[PDB]
Amino acid sequence: GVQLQESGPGLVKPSQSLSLTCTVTGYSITSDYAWNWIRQFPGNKLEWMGYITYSGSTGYNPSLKSRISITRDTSKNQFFLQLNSVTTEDTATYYCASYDDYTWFTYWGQGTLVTVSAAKTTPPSVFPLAPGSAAQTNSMVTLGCLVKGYFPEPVTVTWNSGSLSSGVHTFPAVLQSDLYTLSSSVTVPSSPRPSETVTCNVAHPASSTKVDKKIVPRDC
Amino acid sequence: DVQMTQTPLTLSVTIGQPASISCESSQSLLYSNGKTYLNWLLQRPGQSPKRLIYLVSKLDSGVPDRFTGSGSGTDFTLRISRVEAEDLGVYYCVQGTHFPRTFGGGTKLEIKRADAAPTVSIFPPSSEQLTSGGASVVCFLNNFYPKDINVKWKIDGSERQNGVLNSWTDQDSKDSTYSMSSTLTLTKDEYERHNSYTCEATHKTSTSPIVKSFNRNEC
Amino acid sequence: KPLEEVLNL
DSSP, rough: OOOOEEESSSOOTSSEEEEEEEEEEESSSSSSEEEEEEEOOOTSSSEEEOOOOOOSSOOOOTTTTGGGGEETTTTTTTTEEEEEEEEGGEEEEEEEEOOOOOOSSOOOOOOEEEEEOSSOOOOOOOEEEEESSOOSSSSSSEEEEEEEESSOOOOEEEEEEBBBBBTEEEEEEEEEETTTEEEEEEEEEEETTTTTTOOEEEEGGGGGEEEEEOOOOOOO | OOOOOOOOSSSEEETTTTEEEEEEESSBBBBBOOOOOOEEEETTSSOOEEEEEEETTEEEEEOTTTEEEEETTTTTEEEEESSSSGGOOOEEEOOSSSSSSBBBOEEEEEOOOOOOOOOOEEEEEOHHHHTTTTEEEEEEEEESSOOOOOOEEETTTTOOOTTEEEOOOOOOOOOOOOEEEEEEEEEHHHHHTOOOOEEEEOOOTSOOOOEEEEOOOOO | OOOOOOOOO
């Protein structure tokens, strides 16, 4: 019934102010419960940052107290995180969450990735990975898309606009210099492709980029 | 700050077998009102944490009765009487007694499963990429177990370590397998000075490495 | 200091 949603920039320059929004639907933030900000670092380490109560009082992690602020807009049913003087060490996934620790009520957002970096937003190059001969009369052929040289995370890869969801492996991005490299693979029977069109759809919001690549045979 | 110690770090269990996680708090989490505020969260791969247990032993709505939480003072335990496939993920405990709220390092639960050979595919660089002055050779190693795998690249018979980006997926919830991608990246020049490109996988399912390669002698 | 106290007082 209740839904929490994080929004805000994905890329922030060092020393700037990070500003996030948590929009709440299905419950009023003036009624009850504590409304929290929690971030997860690479490595899976969780850190509670602070909360604002339904009454408007705030509690902050002492390690942040100096440069953290939490506010709310009671007319929009939103609460906000302001973190000053961010460093690259503040790179993390930020969640908002509502609970009270003695009741059944508990809801987390989906989280939003925040990268603190000086690097510029860079659109990906998407290359199609077609087999180099293999066998046409075989059970399964696997194809792929190579998403190379983008910044920052994340990117979304679907196949045929979400028509193929079985046979798909989208591998986590890896960093080399200051550019990410992601890859996806899909396995299909030898009968659909090449007789049918297989297209990978890459979306990079941070750069407002969308690209569709058909996997056409080279074979010969 | 109260620190929470989780054991074990990871945990490999067969479907239908029991499992338990320990959380030790440096201080007593017993508060001055007789309640003890310790919760358990489960973070499935790609999803956000979800609370399972609160106040030590109480189940959250939607949580199967397979889950049991016990303990007091400093020692707490989460017990999965019978592990299923969708129990796959990372478990945390958290204390809300002492300010500030603190979490454990987390315990990773993997599904112990029957061994499974990887299927290996190699892909030459796309024409598009080459007309840009770069060449990436990609090797997919799909649906294998266990996770320990070793990939080698050979260019014209010679092993190459530099320019190789490896990436693992998480445990697949449907078949409990793992997959990884191996990408070798060179300049166009470099790529055009050699003929054979090879992708060797070493895995306990195979006495000899399973090898895929191609020569630059085809569209 | 716990949330139960902070919310109910």
